[PDB]
Structures are given as C-alpha cells and as structure tokens.
Amino acid sequence: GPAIGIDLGTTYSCVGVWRNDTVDIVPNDQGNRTTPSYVAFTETERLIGDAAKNQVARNPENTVFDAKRLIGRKFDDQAVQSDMTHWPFKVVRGPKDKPIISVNYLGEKKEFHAEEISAMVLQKMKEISEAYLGRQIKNAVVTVPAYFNDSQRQATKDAGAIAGLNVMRIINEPTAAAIAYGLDKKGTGERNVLIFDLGGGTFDVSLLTIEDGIFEVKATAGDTHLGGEDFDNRLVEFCVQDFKRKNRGMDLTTNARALRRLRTQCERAKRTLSSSTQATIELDSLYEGIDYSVAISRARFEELCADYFRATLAPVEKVLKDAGMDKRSVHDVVLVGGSTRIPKVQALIQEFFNGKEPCKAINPDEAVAYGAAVQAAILNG
Ligand SMILES: Nc1ncnc2c1ncn2[C@@H]1O[C@H](COP(=O)(O)OP(=O)(O)NP(=O)(O)O)[C@@H](O)[C@H]1O
C-alpha cells in the first residue's frame, strides 16, 4: 500500500502523503497541517489534538502532553524528574525504571507508557491520512531528533506499532528536512547543511554533511526548553502585569478559564505579529466581570523575547565550532519549526550568515513530514 511520513513533534505532529506522484501535507479536521501532540481522558471519552488541548484548563490532571520528553527514558533521569514538576498529570515509577503516566479514564485509574500516549497521536495521523487518501495506510517513516538514543528510537517505533503502523525506518528530523529540499542532489562534491529548528517547546541546530546521497550528522546543539510556548509566556506575563496596573493589582492567574482565554489570544497575537506590525487582544468580562484590551506591536513582542531570540545564535556557533567549520562553509541554511515564521528570528539568522537567503519555500512546520514522506516512498518502492 502507500507510505506516509510522520513528524512526531513535542508540541505538534504533522503527516505527509503521496498523491499524483508528489507530496501533500495532510490537513486535519480544523484545516490545519499540524495537530497538537495532546491527549485527554474524561469519564466518557478520550480526546486527541485540538479537542484535548482546548479543555486543558477544565481537566488538568487527565490532559497529557510532552510524551516526547518521556519516551524511551528512565523514571529516575534528572531531566524526567525536573520535567515532572511542571506537569499536572501524574508520573510514577513502573517496573524496570519505566515512567508510567497515571490518569482517570472512564471512571477508573488508567496507566500508560509514554509510547502509548504517542501511539494515540500516531493513530490520529494514520486516520487523517486514510481519510485524505481514501484508503488503508500502514507503511510509515517516523522522525526523531538526531540526539535520540537507541531506547528513545525503539520506543518511538513501538508507538508506531501500537498505532498499527509498520514503521519501515526511524530517521533523524534534520536529515528529513534536508531530504525535503533535495539537498542530497543540489551540487557536486560535499554539501554542508545547517538545520535551524525552532518549534513549540524545543530548539535544535544540526550541522550535516552530504556526499553522493549519503547524510552525516556532524554536530548538534540547542535547548530542549526554548520554543514558541516560552514566547507566549512572555506575552501572557506582559498582559497579566498590564491587567494588574489597570485594575489595582488584581491577579487573573487565580482563574484558570480567564488565564486560558488570555493565553489563547496571546498565541494568536504572536502569530498575527509574523505577518502584521500590530496585534489586538480584546476580551470582555475577563476577570471579575472586568473587560480587558491591549494593542501589541511587533516591536513590543520582539522586545519581550529579546534574550530568547539572541540565545538562538549560540547553538549555531556551537555546531560550527564542534565540527571545526566556518559559517561561510555552510551551503544551505534550512528554516524548520513553526517559530521560524517570526520575522526577527529570520533577520537574526540571515544577519549571522551575512545576508545569505535561507531554504524556506516549504512551510517550516511541514518540512520534516515532507522529507519523511519522500524517504517513505523510496523505502516503499
Ligand atoms: N505564524 C507564526 N508565527 C509565530 N509562531 C508560530 C507561527 N505559526 C506557528 N508558530 C509556532 O510554532 C510552534 C509549533 O512549532 P512546530 O514546529 O509545529 O512544533 P514541533 O514540531 O512539535 N517542534 P518542538 O515543540 O520544538 O519539538 C508553536 O509554538 C506555534 O505558536
């Protein structure tokens, strides 16, 4: 049958298919090409994606996200123990030091491995692809960060198997982006490719070398706690303080629904600021019947995340140093991840590369899935 390519992201997942000998990115039920990597359990149903993410404030203990931060890892890992302190869902020690997510589902305590949560997200990707292609799908290529170990790779493959997918190969995310642009066919000799990947929760910089279609990850650097979510946090913080001074120090964070309405609008304001210089937040009866509105400029947003945007350049320096390579030696600079849509992030990378135009023709949050779909087709014959 036909083969698909899946980008199983920390915050958003994306699937690419083949129609008429080309790659199509599968739109979900909301017309979006990316789906939140969220699952939720209630007394009557399980919710996936947007439906799960939108009810997070109403059901925090049973809304699971960030399964990618847990997949193939051990319960006692310092990274796992640190992440657990910011999660409202319960994580316990299972046998063989395996993390167990503990929720309530259909009126009973239910346990899940991180790969069972990721399997739900992968099953949703299989469903939308089947609806889109009008046929059964099993063959897939699933991507992972280049730094993932054998345990994390195997657990991602297991998530695929639990979802009913035949995982033909687990490939690296930066390699998938390079494949998406046909960088393994661009010129003669050796090709140096830098993948600049800024998504919802993570920042990954990878330096690859290509020679005669063979890819080699030379160096990787980044921050697993730097993404679009942190930029929203800065906008949310600004609006929370602005409501305090407008309303005698009143704190809207005490009301989960009010904070969620604000956060939802900060996310949309941020997205508007990638195409417009002005964004408007206007929320009637936000907190204690008090109306809230604010005009947020692109300059203000850039000023609020000034430190974050600057900190993206250090891992670019780290990959070039680690490989003993100069920035002028890079033949292709590839923009990957939804947060690379931010004009200031684009301007900073281009300035660093002395005006060099990046590879950005493919939607940055779709490139990994696009590349995974190309690889899937090759492997499927
Ligand atoms: N037009 C836009 N302007 C600014 N940010 C955007 C825009 N569109 C999407 N984003 C951000 O893109 C992020 C999701 O990036 P995406 O690359 O889809 O996540 P991912 O694949 O799960 N990677 P990650 O979270 O790092 O592991 C969210 O924080 C969005 O707010």
Closest CA to 365 of 12, 70, 77: 12
Q: Tell me the two tokens of residue 126.
A: 């299989």
213 annotated as a binding-site residue: no
In angstroms, the CA 239 to CA 248 distance is 14
**228: CA distance to ligand 1 center in Å?**
6
Q: What are the start-end ranges of the H helices in 57-113?
A: 78-84
- The DSSP call for residue 323 is T
Tell me, using a 6 A CB cutoff, whether residue 196 lines ligand 1. no
**Strand pairing report for 63-64 and 99-105:** unpaired
Q: Tell me the two tokens of residue 94.
A: 């299972």
143 annotated as a binding-site residue: no
Q: Are 364 and 10 in contact (CB under 8 A)?
A: no
3-class DSSP assignment, residue 264: helix
- Of 7, 8, 11, 142, the one to substitute when testing ligand 1's pocket (max ligand atoms within 8 A of C-beta) is 11
Q: Which residues of 103-134 are buried (b: 16+ CB within 10 A; e: fewer)?
A: bebeeeeeebbbbbbbbbbbbbbbbbbbebbe
In angstroms, the CA 112 to CA 188 distance is 49
Q: Tell me the two tokens of residue 145.
A: 């960060």
Q: Tell me the two tokens of residue 317.
A: 């320096």
Closest CA to 21 of 310, 377, 336: 377
Atom of ligand 1 lying closest to residue 198 CA: 26
How remote is the C-alpha of 225 from its chain's centroid?
12
**Method of determination used here:** X-ray
Paired with 220 in beta bridges are 206
Tell me, using a 6 A CB cutoff, whether residue 89 lines ligand 1. no
Q: Which residues of 302-327 are buried (b: 16+ CB within 10 A; e: fewer)?
A: bebbeebbeebeebbebbbeeeebee
This PDB structure is determined at a resolution in Å of: 2.2
33 phi and psi angles, rounded to 5 deg: -85, -5
Handedness of CA 168, 174, 176, 182 (dihedral sign): negative
Kindly report the number of other CB atoms within 10 A of residue 238's CB atom: 17
Closest CA to 368 of 211, 144, 200, 186: 144
The residue ranges of DSSP E strands in the chain, in sequence order, are 4-8, 12-19, 22-25, 35-36, 39-41, 46-48, 63-64, 90-93, 99-105, 108-112, 139-144, 166-172, 191-198, 203-211, 214-223, 278-287, 290-297, 332-336
Q: What domains does the chain contain, in order, with CATH numbers?
A: 1-64+121-185+360-380 (3.30.420.40), 65-120 (3.30.30.30), 186-226+312-359 (3.30.420.40), 227-311 (3.90.640.10)
- Give the catalytic positions in this structure: 7, 68, 173, 197
In angstroms, the CA 307 to CA 297 distance is 18
Paired with 64 in beta bridges are 39
